[PDB]
Amino acid sequence: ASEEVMACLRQERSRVENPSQTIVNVVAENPAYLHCSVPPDAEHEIAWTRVSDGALLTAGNRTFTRDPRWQVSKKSANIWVLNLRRAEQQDSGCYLCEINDKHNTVYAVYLKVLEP
Amino acid sequence: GAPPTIQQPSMSSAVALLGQDVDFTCIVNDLGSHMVAFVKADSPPRLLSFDEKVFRRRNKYELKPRIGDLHNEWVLTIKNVQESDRGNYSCQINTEPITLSTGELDVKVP
Ligand SMILES: *[C@@H]1O[C@H](CO)[C@@H](O[C@@H]2O[C@H](CO)[C@@H](O)[C@H](O)[C@H]2NC(C)=O)[C@H](O)[C@H]1NC(C)=O
């Protein structure tokens, strides 16, 4: 279990440590919110990917996946949020937020959905 | 009729010479309202294009959607290939489960 989280979080590629949560525990059927930080005043686009299958979930301000439970939004000037509206145990695993910036920043988040 | 399929020959594995341009072709039938993404399947994986848009390094990649005789070939060109471009490239259709085709690029240096 520790190795699985480490294998996820080792995938971060960033100039400065991720300032946001990178381990998210939620109860099944509740929503989850994964955060991706971007510099102030930049105009970068971001993409969220699910690592287990490589599925592209969102790209830019559009959802890409056809799974209706996912939405991306700008929470504030510096924070994008991937919202998973009704988490299930099968959603547990590694998620990545990639930024189209010059250093090709990648943030990794591990999601654990607890099944009662 | 049928769900989206990736038709042979797609995402052909290749060895290229340093500096060549390399095309990866994803032939998609019955795409319907689905969308196609190209990804570099490194660890972490890297998004190259989604739908009709290139996501990074605009002068490095070119995407040509729906070309060929039957308007069903999606061609990603990697320009001026380098050792850093070595690895696996995947075409993905956003079905659930996803529909994938992958090919490996080798790059030979003089
Ligand atoms: C590209 O993907 C192939 C698999 O499709 C990788 O080849 C495998 O490599 C792993 C070790 O990394 C071996 O355990 C497998 O047996 C190999 N399989 C085959 C069919 O060759 C290859 O390493 C990948 N290239 C990368 C990651 O650069």
Backbone phi, then psi, for B79, in 5-degree steps?
-90, 145
- Asked if B5 and B29 count as a contact pair (C-beta separation under 8 A), the reply is yes
Q: How many CA atoms lie within 13 A of A86 on its CB side?
A: 4
Q: What is the DSSP string of A47-67?
A: EEEETTT--EEEETTEE-SS-
Q: Which residues contact B69 (CB under 8 A, 6 or more apart)?
A: none
Distance CA B105, CA B95 (A): 25
C-beta atoms surrounding A12 within 10 Å: 17
Q: Do B44 and A106 touch (CB under 8 A)?
A: yes
- Give the method used: X-ray
Cα–Cα distances in angstroms (integers) from residue A76 to residues A41, A47, A103, in the given order = 12, 17, 22
AA identity, residue A71: Q
Task: Quote the tokens at residue B15.
Answer: 């060895």
Which residue, among A92, A62, A71, A66, has the nearest Cα to B98 in the 3D structure?
A66
Number of domains observed in the structure of chain A: 1
Three-class secondary structure of residue B20 per DSSP: coil
Q: Do B44 and A54 touch (CB under 8 A)?
A: no
Cα(B19) to ligand 1 centroid in Å equals 24
Q: Quick one: chain A helix, strand, coil %, rounded to 5? A: 10, 45, 45
Of A56, A100, A106, the CB nearest to B94: A56
Three-class secondary structure of residue B83 per DSSP: helix
The answer, yes or no, to whether the previous bond of B3 is cis (omega within 30 of 0) is no
CA distance A106 to chain B (A): 8
Three-class secondary structure of residue A2 per DSSP: helix
Residue A44 near chain B (CB below 8 Å):
no
CATH number of residue B15's parent domain: 2.60.40.10
Cα–Cα distances in angstroms (integers) from residue B14 to residues B8, B19, B21, B26, B35, in the given order = 15, 14, 12, 14, 25
Q: What is the DSSP-derived secondary structure letter of residue B8?
A: S
Domain with B88 in it: 1-110
**Ligand 1 binding pocket includes B87 (Cβ within 6 Å):** yes
Task: Quote the tokens at residue A103.
Answer: 């250093």
Domain with A20 in it: 1-116
Q: Please count the residues of chain A.
A: 116
Number of domains observed in the structure of chain B: 1
**Ligand 1 binding pocket includes B77 (Cβ within 6 Å):** no
Distance CA A24, CA A10 (A): 16
CA distance A69 to chain B (A): 13
Sequence-distant contacts of A65-71: CB under 8 A, at least 24 apart: A65/B94, A65/B96, A66/B34, A66/B94, A66/B95, A66/B96, A67/B96
AA identity, residue A28: A
- Asked if B14 and B81 count as a contact pair (C-beta separation under 8 A), the reply is no
